[PDB]
Amino acid sequence: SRPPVQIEELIEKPGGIIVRWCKVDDDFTAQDYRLQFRKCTANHFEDVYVGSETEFIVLHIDPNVDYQFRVCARGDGRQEWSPWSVPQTGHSTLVPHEWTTGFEGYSLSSRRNIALRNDAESSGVLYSSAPTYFCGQTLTFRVETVGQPDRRDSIGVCAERQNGYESLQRDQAVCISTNGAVFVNGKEMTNQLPAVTSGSTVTFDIEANAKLRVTISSNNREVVFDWLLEQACGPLYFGCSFFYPGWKVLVF
């Protein structure tokens, strides 16, 4: 008849929200907690976590959208859930995905989100402007226009901005090439995705050395695999590389 649990912290990040709750009546003995969320615009809460832990990382949230969260608890001999905490509203933070400006061989759109491979010599991979891929984000690229394909073509994600290599087909990176081949720490997988054409999207979903699970989607097919990284799930760079002119990639 009193809420035994309240939300204690809301940790708003670019790719999700961590909700942490605390038992506010020491005399309550909790078996299970139940966390729900909804968009502030929606008329229905849905369960996102039921279990004995007192925090949960909520990854399926759109940026720029407010969500409401509430939590309750149930005792061991009582089947009925307790009253709910006061609800709390949260949102992910906003860190735009943009390409590096001033990198030879690539021309950018005014908002720095579309990169075109031009006729100039290029020193290597065009990286994001900073490591702005955060775990929990769905990172989406769209291929606007194409050029001649080449074995060193890549689109992907990696730990560090490294100027040496010709592509992201290298250690501490995951990428796809323009033939649909997928590389994990520079090692090509047997399974391929359909090769990109203009209009194709490529999506990366990465969820927690360190063992991450990576889902790459493209042209209505997916591959899923393990990626072992020596960093943690800290923010990652993204990048692309194309040898021949005409390839143009939007990042969302």
Tab-separated table of C-alpha atoms in Angstrom:
chain	number	residue	atom	x	y	z
A	1	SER	CA	0.000	0.000	0.000
A	2	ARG	CA	3.157	2.099	-0.122
A	3	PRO	CA	5.556	1.848	-3.033
A	4	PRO	CA	8.510	-0.151	-1.703
A	5	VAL	CA	10.726	0.866	-4.608
A	6	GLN	CA	11.542	4.142	-6.336
A	7	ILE	CA	13.727	5.044	-9.268
A	8	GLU	CA	17.072	6.273	-7.871
A	9	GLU	CA	19.070	7.125	-10.973
A	10	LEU	CA	18.376	7.662	-14.633
A	11	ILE	CA	21.576	7.586	-16.715
A	12	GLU	CA	20.873	9.166	-20.115
A	13	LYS	CA	23.397	8.195	-22.801
A	14	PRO	CA	23.464	8.476	-26.590
A	15	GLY	CA	22.343	4.896	-27.179
A	16	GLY	CA	20.037	4.163	-24.282
A	17	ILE	CA	18.981	4.883	-20.722
A	18	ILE	CA	20.141	3.038	-17.588
A	19	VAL	CA	17.432	2.908	-14.936
A	20	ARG	CA	18.498	2.154	-11.347
A	21	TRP	CA	16.072	1.690	-8.482
A	22	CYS	CA	16.282	1.309	-4.737
A	23	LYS	CA	14.151	-0.333	-2.118
A	24	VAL	CA	12.885	2.528	0.067
A	25	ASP	CA	11.347	0.328	2.844
A	26	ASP	CA	14.061	-1.797	4.521
A	27	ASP	CA	11.263	-3.917	6.033
A	28	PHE	CA	10.095	-5.042	2.572
A	29	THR	CA	11.657	-8.325	1.354
A	30	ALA	CA	11.764	-8.329	-2.426
A	31	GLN	CA	11.742	-11.422	-4.585
A	32	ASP	CA	11.403	-9.682	-7.950
A	33	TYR	CA	11.285	-6.236	-9.550
A	34	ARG	CA	9.290	-5.158	-12.612
A	35	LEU	CA	10.403	-2.226	-14.805
A	36	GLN	CA	8.129	-0.765	-17.506
A	37	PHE	CA	8.486	2.066	-20.004
A	38	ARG	CA	6.501	3.916	-22.661
A	39	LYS	CA	6.919	6.904	-24.922
A	40	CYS	CA	5.440	9.965	-23.215
A	41	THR	CA	3.045	10.175	-26.180
A	42	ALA	CA	1.827	6.576	-25.716
A	43	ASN	CA	-1.059	5.300	-23.577
A	44	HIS	CA	0.423	1.932	-22.609
A	45	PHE	CA	3.329	0.776	-20.467
A	46	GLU	CA	5.213	-2.346	-21.433
A	47	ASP	CA	7.453	-4.539	-19.343
A	48	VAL	CA	11.139	-4.291	-20.178
A	49	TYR	CA	12.687	-6.129	-17.225
A	50	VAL	CA	11.392	-8.604	-14.638
A	51	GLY	CA	13.943	-10.033	-12.241
A	52	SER	CA	15.941	-9.642	-9.074
A	53	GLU	CA	18.386	-6.957	-10.222
A	54	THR	CA	17.999	-3.284	-9.288
A	55	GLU	CA	19.136	-1.785	-12.600
A	56	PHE	CA	18.494	-2.341	-16.285
A	57	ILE	CA	19.928	-0.809	-19.458
A	58	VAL	CA	17.129	0.193	-21.847
A	59	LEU	CA	18.444	0.144	-25.411
A	60	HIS	CA	15.319	0.319	-27.570
A	61	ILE	CA	14.643	4.036	-27.428
A	62	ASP	CA	14.553	6.542	-30.211
A	63	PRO	CA	16.689	9.680	-29.838
A	64	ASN	CA	14.816	12.990	-29.401
A	65	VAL	CA	11.868	11.178	-27.740
A	66	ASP	CA	10.844	11.378	-24.090
A	67	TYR	CA	10.033	8.088	-22.318
A	68	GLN	CA	8.372	7.399	-18.974
A	69	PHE	CA	9.598	4.658	-16.634
A	70	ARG	CA	8.059	3.053	-13.551
A	71	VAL	CA	9.081	0.147	-11.314
A	72	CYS	CA	7.443	-2.056	-8.704
A	73	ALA	CA	8.343	-5.080	-6.612
A	74	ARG	CA	6.798	-8.221	-5.259
A	75	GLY	CA	7.551	-10.180	-2.115
A	76	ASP	CA	8.350	-13.860	-1.935
A	77	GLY	CA	5.062	-15.137	-0.492
A	78	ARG	CA	2.919	-12.509	-2.199
A	79	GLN	CA	2.006	-13.025	-5.841
A	80	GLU	CA	0.647	-9.469	-6.213
A	81	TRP	CA	2.936	-6.690	-7.431
A	82	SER	CA	3.351	-3.703	-5.146
A	83	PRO	CA	2.201	-0.224	-6.116
A	84	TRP	CA	4.387	1.544	-8.634
A	85	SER	CA	7.152	4.032	-8.024
A	86	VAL	CA	6.581	7.584	-9.034
A	87	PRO	CA	7.197	7.616	-12.793
A	88	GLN	CA	10.304	9.299	-14.146
A	89	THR	CA	10.856	10.695	-17.619
A	90	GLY	CA	14.069	10.279	-19.545
A	91	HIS	CA	15.540	10.563	-23.007
A	92	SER	CA	18.768	9.580	-24.701
A	93	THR	CA	21.294	12.333	-25.330
A	94	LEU	CA	22.074	13.695	-28.774
A	95	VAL	CA	25.531	13.359	-30.298
A	96	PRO	CA	25.383	13.743	-34.092
A	97	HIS	CA	27.105	11.275	-36.404
A	98	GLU	CA	29.347	13.164	-38.844
A	99	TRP	CA	32.341	12.521	-41.076
A	100	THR	CA	35.780	14.077	-40.567
A	101	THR	CA	36.107	17.360	-42.411
A	102	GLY	CA	39.164	18.205	-44.416
A	103	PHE	CA	40.162	14.630	-45.271
A	104	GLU	CA	41.688	14.403	-48.752
A	105	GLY	CA	39.766	12.299	-51.248
A	106	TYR	CA	36.262	12.832	-49.822
A	107	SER	CA	33.831	15.720	-50.324
A	108	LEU	CA	31.158	16.315	-47.645
A	109	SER	CA	27.631	17.714	-47.684
A	110	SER	CA	26.818	20.895	-45.760
A	111	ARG	CA	25.726	18.961	-42.666
A	112	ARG	CA	28.826	16.739	-42.895
A	113	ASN	CA	26.747	13.541	-42.943
A	114	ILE	CA	27.163	12.588	-46.618
A	115	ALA	CA	30.632	11.740	-47.908
A	116	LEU	CA	31.520	11.407	-51.593
A	117	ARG	CA	34.697	9.773	-52.829
A	118	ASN	CA	36.197	12.146	-55.404
A	119	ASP	CA	39.094	11.994	-57.881
A	120	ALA	CA	41.771	13.000	-55.367
A	121	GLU	CA	44.271	10.668	-53.765
A	122	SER	CA	43.177	9.445	-50.328
A	123	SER	CA	45.495	8.544	-47.438
A	124	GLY	CA	43.166	5.867	-46.040
A	125	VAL	CA	39.897	5.486	-44.153
A	126	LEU	CA	37.464	8.362	-43.789
A	127	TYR	CA	36.600	8.257	-40.110
A	128	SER	CA	33.794	9.785	-38.140
A	129	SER	CA	34.704	13.218	-36.784
A	130	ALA	CA	35.134	11.692	-33.329
A	131	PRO	CA	34.190	8.364	-31.703
A	132	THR	CA	30.465	8.962	-31.768
A	133	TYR	CA	29.120	5.416	-32.128
A	134	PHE	CA	27.840	4.590	-28.653
A	135	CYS	CA	26.813	1.160	-27.544
A	136	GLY	CA	23.089	0.657	-27.918
A	137	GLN	CA	22.813	2.849	-30.977
A	138	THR	CA	21.595	1.494	-34.264
A	139	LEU	CA	24.137	2.985	-36.648
A	140	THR	CA	22.631	3.301	-40.125
A	141	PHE	CA	24.318	4.147	-43.423
A	142	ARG	CA	22.689	4.586	-46.805
A	143	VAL	CA	24.507	4.233	-50.107
A	144	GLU	CA	23.405	7.203	-52.224
A	145	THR	CA	25.540	6.614	-55.278
A	146	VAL	CA	28.084	3.984	-56.316
A	147	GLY	CA	31.395	3.734	-58.103
A	148	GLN	CA	33.565	0.895	-59.308
A	149	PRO	CA	34.006	-1.698	-56.531
A	150	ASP	CA	37.377	-2.592	-55.045
A	151	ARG	CA	38.579	-5.181	-52.562
A	152	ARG	CA	39.578	-2.465	-50.039
A	153	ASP	CA	36.101	-0.898	-49.919
A	154	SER	CA	34.746	-0.823	-46.380
A	155	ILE	CA	32.016	0.552	-44.150
A	156	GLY	CA	32.356	-0.177	-40.443
A	157	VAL	CA	33.211	0.545	-36.836
A	158	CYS	CA	36.477	0.445	-34.892
A	159	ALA	CA	38.221	1.367	-31.643
A	160	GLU	CA	40.852	3.898	-32.856
A	161	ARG	CA	41.495	6.390	-35.702
A	162	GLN	CA	44.506	4.866	-37.479
A	163	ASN	CA	45.896	6.517	-40.606
A	164	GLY	CA	47.996	3.626	-41.949
A	165	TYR	CA	45.626	1.046	-43.413
A	166	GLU	CA	43.649	1.180	-46.670
A	167	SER	CA	40.398	-0.087	-45.137
A	168	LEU	CA	38.711	-1.220	-41.940
A	169	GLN	CA	39.548	-4.840	-42.802
A	170	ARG	CA	41.946	-4.877	-39.860
A	171	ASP	CA	42.291	-5.766	-36.190
A	172	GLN	CA	40.016	-4.026	-33.632
A	173	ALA	CA	37.446	-3.203	-36.327
A	174	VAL	CA	34.338	-4.743	-37.910
A	175	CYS	CA	33.212	-3.819	-41.401
A	176	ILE	CA	31.435	-4.839	-44.590
A	177	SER	CA	32.783	-4.478	-48.101
A	178	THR	CA	30.905	-3.563	-51.243
A	179	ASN	CA	30.584	-7.202	-52.285
A	180	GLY	CA	28.699	-8.029	-49.050
A	181	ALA	CA	31.675	-9.641	-47.342
A	182	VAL	CA	31.923	-9.127	-43.587
A	183	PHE	CA	35.242	-8.792	-41.742
A	184	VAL	CA	35.747	-9.190	-37.982
A	185	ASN	CA	39.134	-7.985	-36.699
A	186	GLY	CA	40.314	-8.231	-40.289
A	187	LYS	CA	39.119	-11.834	-40.729
A	188	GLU	CA	36.570	-12.419	-43.492
A	189	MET	CA	33.449	-14.424	-42.614
A	190	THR	CA	32.099	-17.180	-44.836
A	191	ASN	CA	28.581	-15.740	-44.857
A	192	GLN	CA	27.947	-12.625	-46.916
A	193	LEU	CA	25.254	-10.017	-47.167
A	194	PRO	CA	23.785	-8.886	-50.496
A	195	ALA	CA	26.099	-6.443	-52.222
A	196	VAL	CA	25.112	-2.797	-51.803
A	197	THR	CA	23.545	-0.785	-54.598
A	198	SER	CA	22.253	2.780	-54.559
A	199	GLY	CA	19.478	2.896	-51.973
A	200	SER	CA	20.959	0.081	-49.904
A	201	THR	CA	21.227	0.631	-46.188
A	202	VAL	CA	23.747	-0.945	-43.831
A	203	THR	CA	23.034	-1.103	-40.113
A	204	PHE	CA	25.261	-1.934	-37.137
A	205	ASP	CA	23.929	-2.982	-33.730
A	206	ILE	CA	26.502	-3.699	-31.026
A	207	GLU	CA	25.558	-4.933	-27.547
A	208	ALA	CA	27.758	-5.831	-24.588
A	209	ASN	CA	39.278	-8.084	-23.342
A	210	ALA	CA	35.542	-7.709	-24.160
A	211	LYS	CA	32.965	-9.876	-25.995
A	212	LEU	CA	30.427	-7.881	-28.028
A	213	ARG	CA	27.580	-9.243	-30.151
A	214	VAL	CA	27.304	-7.535	-33.541
A	215	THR	CA	24.290	-7.546	-35.863
A	216	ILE	CA	24.914	-6.203	-39.363
A	217	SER	CA	21.853	-5.755	-41.567
A	218	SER	CA	21.713	-4.845	-45.230
A	219	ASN	CA	19.208	-5.358	-48.065
A	220	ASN	CA	16.842	-7.307	-45.758
A	221	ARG	CA	19.460	-9.825	-44.590
A	222	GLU	CA	21.394	-10.027	-41.325
A	223	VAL	CA	24.494	-11.622	-39.951
A	224	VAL	CA	25.193	-11.891	-36.209
A	225	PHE	CA	28.540	-12.753	-34.648
A	226	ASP	CA	30.884	-12.244	-31.719
A	227	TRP	CA	33.481	-9.471	-31.803
A	228	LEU	CA	36.330	-9.604	-29.293
A	229	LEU	CA	37.665	-6.124	-28.548
A	230	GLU	CA	40.532	-5.177	-26.229
A	231	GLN	CA	38.808	-1.927	-25.243
A	232	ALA	CA	35.461	-1.963	-23.444
A	233	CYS	CA	32.197	-0.962	-25.147
A	234	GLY	CA	33.480	2.638	-24.936
A	235	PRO	CA	32.520	4.945	-27.794
A	236	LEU	CA	33.711	3.701	-31.182
A	237	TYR	CA	34.642	5.354	-34.426
A	238	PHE	CA	32.899	4.598	-37.650
A	239	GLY	CA	34.529	4.901	-41.033
A	240	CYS	CA	34.463	4.103	-44.704
A	241	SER	CA	36.929	3.571	-47.495
A	242	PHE	CA	36.561	3.422	-51.274
A	243	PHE	CA	39.358	3.291	-53.824
A	244	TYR	CA	37.352	4.535	-56.843
A	245	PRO	CA	35.369	7.759	-57.212
A	246	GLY	CA	31.609	7.992	-57.079
A	247	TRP	CA	30.830	6.092	-53.878
A	248	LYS	CA	28.677	8.328	-51.670
A	249	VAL	CA	27.519	7.346	-48.191
A	250	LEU	CA	24.989	9.009	-45.879
A	251	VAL	CA	25.259	8.353	-42.129
A	252	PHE	CA	22.197	8.913	-39.905
